Amino acid sequence: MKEVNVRESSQEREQRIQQQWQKGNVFQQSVQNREGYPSFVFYEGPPTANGLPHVGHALGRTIKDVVARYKTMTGHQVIRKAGWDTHGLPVELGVEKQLGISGKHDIEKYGVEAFINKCKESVFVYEKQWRTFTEQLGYWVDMEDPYITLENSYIESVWNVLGTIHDKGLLYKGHRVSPYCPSCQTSLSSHEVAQGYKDVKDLTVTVKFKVKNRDNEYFLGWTTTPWTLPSNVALAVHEEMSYVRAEQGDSVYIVAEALADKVLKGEYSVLSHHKGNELKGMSYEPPFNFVKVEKGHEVVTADYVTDQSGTGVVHLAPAYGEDDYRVVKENGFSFVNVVDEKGQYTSEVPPFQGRFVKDCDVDIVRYLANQDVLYHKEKHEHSYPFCWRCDSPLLYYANESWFIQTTALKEQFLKNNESVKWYPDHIKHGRFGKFLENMVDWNISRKRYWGTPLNVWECEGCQHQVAPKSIKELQKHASHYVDDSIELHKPYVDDVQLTCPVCSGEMKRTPEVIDVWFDSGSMPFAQYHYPFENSELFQKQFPADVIAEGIDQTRGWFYSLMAVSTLFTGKAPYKRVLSLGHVLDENGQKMSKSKGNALDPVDLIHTFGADALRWALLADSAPWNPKKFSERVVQEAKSKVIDTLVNVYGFYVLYAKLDGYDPEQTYELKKTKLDEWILSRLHSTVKRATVHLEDYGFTSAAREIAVFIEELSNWYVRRSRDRFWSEGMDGEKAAAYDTLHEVLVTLSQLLAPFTPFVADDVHENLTGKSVHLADYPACDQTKVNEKLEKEMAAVLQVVELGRSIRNTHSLKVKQPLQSLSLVVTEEDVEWKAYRDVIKDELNVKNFNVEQDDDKVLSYVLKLDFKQAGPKFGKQVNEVNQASEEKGKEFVEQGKLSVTLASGENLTLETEDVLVEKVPKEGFAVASNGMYTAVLDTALTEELVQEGVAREVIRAVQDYRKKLDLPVNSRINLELSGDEEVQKAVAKFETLLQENLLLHSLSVKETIKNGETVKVGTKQVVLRVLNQS
């Protein structure tokens, strides 16, 4: 065993262990040694090296590493794989911001290829910081062998999945309506929309839609957006609502019965009543007829039509509203869109072509009035959403896009989710399950340059679609040569055309790339270039036994993994999900870039060590409970767990080497109750931490281990130091070494998944072998002694009571007191087996176990005027409750009743008496639960003297340490002090001789070149010197 510097910094210890791991090839050995054992599989959600790692990564990688180490130690082979998610809109946006250009014209003016190369360059800028973070956190993985989503082989596997999906007919071109900025040409989120409202005055109109082949009858439709009127496709009514034919002069208007008084201006006669279902299929004339709608201009019924707004008859334009889109499609009516991506009318609306639609509202209302189809108009004051980024007005707009018809497999999604164990449980049928229940199809295409190209080619002749699954298929179908080296990115693949298998015309690739969530959801198949290679490795690494990422992946990676795998294989790609809460600052605010309140994990590792950071990320709350993180939280883990272990470990190594202890020898062993207690607690801890870890309960396993470490240091080691300091090697000393040796070996194994650096420092020094090649320890049931555990815990309650009495009266522990006395009802605990440990801990001369109070307390008895409500003889209970007083009170305490005689009669008291235990002169009392402790706080000259001598001893031990003297050396000591110090030292000379290693001790009047130290509040000069 090498010596231990308990003051060695964490950074130095962890770098030393890291060097052992490289020298011993320990990570790779930990995997090879499990060749043949069952496989345990985990997937990491691939991060990106265009940003620095943050404490969110540190939380998730600590949890994955704990699981991997634990499953390795319990008999599994755990292959570790990392990857980089390199496509993704932020990459492209960062290059646009760096170059100062945007939009298709400027990027192509710049050169697509050159633009693509900047994106490539931007994604690994922080690779070196990622390597340092990964290594220093102790997250074992080969960073020379990542998968990378921009590599051809990765992309080729993604194309293979997409082509398989296309084969099933599940990949289609469609439209989806969303809030949309016509200036930025992008769809905004609800949160983005909520940020940008603004108040406006515009026009709403009630429009006449003439009924075909009737005399002067019209549906009336109300709208807030006149510019959608040239694109009318249908009128919707509610099946069950009541409608009237209302006559006004020469015309008849059809509106809802309940809205007619509001919507019609002036009086009307009701000609007839109709349910909306009777209006279904009625043909009408639209207000404009230049846009072609092949199927439409009829009334349809739809449940969302209400009696609370408009006329009850709703104009539908399917490209400018989500309900409009759905209802038109439900009825098999034509989809039309007469507005371009800039919010401008196309050539399909000739009189307004090229103008921004909202700018045309006034001109359309003038046209309606000029054409006699405007029934009513009014000024409208309301709030309208604008673009935070340019305050252009927003629009409801349908872009054309590619979709995967995931809804076609909704039932398989739900079945696969049912097979997953979620942590916490409620995510399964809550956040995640409800997202599945409300599934819409996956909008897969993106109109940008950097990303996985969507591998769909369309014939310019007949629009037939071919989707190459591979480079070989691309080359086979291409109408020209395609080199083996073709890069699967834009623009290279846009220059490849195929021969249409239907008509032999030219096929051109659709221009879009795919959603980055599809790349990362494809990682179970693409990470190993499946099915082109590695089919055995893939099958062994599918599905994952566990993943662990933030709960924000509910609609992200958790969903894209499930969706890609369900589409491709039908199967769930993971068996369990550990969800993580986003880390908070000490104020409970989420850590974010903009606020500057994040704590860098590499900073925290440098200050406190990775063991302490990992512990702080695992302890005191579950992974899915957001942590209020601070440096103080890491410091507490370092002090309570890391440093405490290191100090116990260094104590063992120091004394084992001094005494030449060797676990290989057989010694005569007399084990004490303390030895048996800590070995029992150790195996109880093994048992309980294992159960928790089997269920992924790191928090409770951490808690169990921390309690053990505290008991080990604060009770077992503290109350056994005398056996280690002893001269010789009797049976009780050998038992101490034997016991603490086993404790440290087993505890370092237990800790190995949590705190892998210090665990291996302890284990390798004691055993010569890396802890990370060990098996997780087994509980030895024969060393579990629940009776001893329950006994020692009662002993600890009494120690706590004694200490609290001392603290209450400011009586230092070094100051001996005459006695502690304990009064117990039950003969529950064998107190004589722990008397010496109790007297040592509490520094009392006598420990008395009492069944009674008599010698210790007197009882004062009052009547309880609150409970003695009935008894009207309060003058009698006053005199009856006012030597003989001591005898009568002790009598009523034990018997729990009382019989006092009034002025003539006798009454029977019970629970109507308030009792006061008054400590006798010089005693102080405290109680909890079953136990009452009474401390004799009376100091005497001789007790005070002995305390002074105990403080001299401790001052000498401290000074020897400050001089860095070995603990086994004998010294010549000079001491100078006041007359009380001189006299205490002479009187307790043999106590000093027995507790200090001394060649001589000279009390001198004055000392040359001594050092002044504190003995209590006294100043004493000490000198250590040489003498022949």
Ligand SMILES: C/C(=C\C(=O)OCCCCCCCCC(=O)O)C[C@@H]1OC[C@H](C[C@@H]2O[C@H]2[C@@H](C)[C@H](C)O)[C@@H](O)[C@H]1O
């Ligand atoms: C718990 C989380 C963040 C957190 O706790 O963040 C707290 C710290 C944020 C502070 C940022 C500011 C740092 C710099 C500064 O000071 O300015 C969320 C998790 O993040 C980690 C992982 C990210 C992977 O990419 C996701 C993959 C799965 C997907 C395919 O893309 C993932 O598990 C994610 O769910």
Ligand SMILES: [Zn+2]
């Ligand atoms: Zn905008």
Ligand SMILES: [Zn+2]
């Ligand atoms: Zn064709």
